Amino acid sequence: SLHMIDYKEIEVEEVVGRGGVVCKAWRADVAIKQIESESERKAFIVELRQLSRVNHPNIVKLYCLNPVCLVMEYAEGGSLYNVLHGAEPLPYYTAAHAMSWCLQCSQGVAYLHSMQPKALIHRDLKPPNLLLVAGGTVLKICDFGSAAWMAPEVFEGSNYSEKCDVFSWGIILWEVITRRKPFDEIGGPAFRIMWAVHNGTRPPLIKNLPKPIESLMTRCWSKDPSQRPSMEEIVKIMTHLMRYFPGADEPLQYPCQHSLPPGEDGRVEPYVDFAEFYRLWSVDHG
Ligand SMILES: C=CC(=O)Nc1ccc(Oc2nc(Nc3ccc(N4CCN(C)CC4)cc3)nc3[nH]ccc23)cc1
């Protein structure tokens, strides 16, 4: 379903980073990653079979076979990780942006869980794989250590299902609300986090978190994957909550010297402010 390109047609510009290697650059802006060594071919081709079927707003759009190369939509905004924890100066964002991002993420993952004949599992949902465009207001996923966002049945070898992507989304929800790195204090190598999560450890709960949001977030954290909601249920819930989070379309433009309080009492302070939420919620309820 794709569209070949002549390699001479592309004009390289700059380098971006490694997920292969991605480079900035066609027909008057695109992002491309050339393959390195034949070991990645057998995977590189799969991505092609997948992305060519995919067509969704919140998933990176896939626009050469000699040399093997991909030409994808360029995300001028960068990764969500760089927005939350990247280089100074960091941008200010609101509760509306946190919820909007997560919603758009669930929208894109639900489209994957609905593909026929078989569903597609991302299996590596984390902010570094979530790109932003339109002034940081639109989120797009790119399938192309993940211990913090990995469901406990995944790294235990148990035959997992798409519900592993739900667990990740739940962690991503806690990350944008607190603007913290999940299990940053644990540290050490990857296995020290797997042991913690495997034992039931989850991120600390959030002061003043709305019970509707605290409920959904933890339901996604449940050990039993069958007690986790489906993405379709997340999309629906998140869609209805956006009614209490206006201003998602406002771009990121203001800086933010952000102080990080330490995790005191196993209960952290959110970065976003839920004042406007409770206010709008009292209006409808009463
Ligand atoms: C810190 C984690 C991280 O950046 N991960 C990451 C993920 C993908 C990636 O490649 C892409 N980038 C982008 N946009 C983009 C991504 C990152 C960046 N920079 C900006 C400068 N610097 C802060 C590093 C990150 C600039 C633009 N669009 C893409 N479309 C298809 C692939 C692709 C490049 C990097």
Side-chain angles (χ1 to χ4, degrees):
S1 304
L2 59 84
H3 173 287
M4 318 308 315
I5 303 176
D6 188 43
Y7 196 108
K8 257 221 183 187
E9 221 169 348
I10 300 145
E11 163 176 294
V12 182
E13 287 217 67
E14 319 160 24
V15 187
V16 175
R18 285 98 187 178
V21 54
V22 183
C23 314
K24 191 189 191 312
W26 180 72
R27 316 236 167 153
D29 270 318
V30 300
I32 76 174
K33 55 140 41 176
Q34 307 162 327
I35 186 173
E36 299 180 359
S37 83
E38 310 179 332
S39 55
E40 323 191 294
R41 270 209 215 104
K42 316 305 155 106
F44 191 110
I45 70 95
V46 172
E47 248 199 89
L48 202 59
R49 183 192 316 102
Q50 292 175 352
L51 262 171
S52 57
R53 309 154 62 188
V54 171
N55 177 247
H56 190 275
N58 304 120
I59 305 172
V60 65
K61 181 181 287 150
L62 164 51
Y63 292 136
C64 320
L65 307 190
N66 211 282
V68 177
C69 192
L70 280 167
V71 181
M72 295 177 289
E73 172 188 8
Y74 178 59
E76 62 269 18
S79 85
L80 182 65
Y81 169 91
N82 171 84
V83 165
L84 306 164
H85 323 286
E88 303 276 327
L90 289 181
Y92 169 82
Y93 67 91
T94 60
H97 286 121
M99 302 295 291
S100 171
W101 288 333
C102 292
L103 166 58
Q104 294 174 77
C105 183
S106 71
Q107 290 190 327
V109 180
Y111 175 85
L112 300 182
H113 293 181
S114 77
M115 294 297 293
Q116 297 299 329
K118 68 134 194 161
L120 283 172
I121 294 174
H122 195 277
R123 241 296 299 275
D124 203 30
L125 273 182
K126 51 181 175 181
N129 296 332
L130 308 175
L131 309 185
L132 302 173
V133 299
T137 64
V138 171
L139 185 149
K140 299 193 180 188
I141 319 167
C142 54
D143 291 276
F144 105 94
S146 300
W149 307 271
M150 201 152 290
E153 73 272 356
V154 166
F155 53 69
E156 92 183 22
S158 295
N159 191 8
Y160 62 93
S161 66
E162 62 281 335
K163 288 293 188 70
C164 74
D165 290 336
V166 163
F167 187 95
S168 304
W169 181 96
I171 297 293
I172 295 179
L173 185 67
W174 177 99
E175 179 165 9
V176 296
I177 290 178
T178 63
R179 197 165 201 170
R180 296 176 173 270
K181 295 189 175 142
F183 307 116
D184 205 32
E185 185 179 357
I186 282 174
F191 67 84
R192 291 193 68 247
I193 295 171
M194 302 186 193
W195 169 267
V197 174
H198 192 65
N199 270 16
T201 303
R202 300 290 185 275
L205 299 190
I206 302 167
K207 283 175 186 171
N208 198 35
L209 188 67
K211 289 180 184 177
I213 293 179
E214 189 176 275
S215 172
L216 179 63
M217 187 189 302
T218 55
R219 278 178 71 207
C220 296
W221 290 350
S222 53
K223 185 175 191 65
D224 192 342
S226 58
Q227 299 309 131
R228 297 174 197 161
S230 57
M231 274 299 173
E232 292 300 344
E233 188 176 339
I234 283 163
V235 174
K236 225 70 164 183
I237 293 163
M238 289 294 287
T239 291
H240 295 326
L241 281 177
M242 292 309 299
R243 169 168 167 74
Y244 307 87
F245 293 98
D249 53 334
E250 291 301 332
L252 282 54
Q253 58 195 293
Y254 314 95
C256 173
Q257 168 49 29
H258 169 208
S259 305
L260 291 165
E264 286 292 0
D265 200 37
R267 194 171 187 236
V268 300
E269 261 281 323
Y271 164 75
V272 298
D273 191 339
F274 287 109
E276 189 69 1
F277 167 85
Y278 289 118
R279 209 197 321 277
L280 301 177
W281 185 277
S282 294
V283 164
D284 284 16
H285 301 69

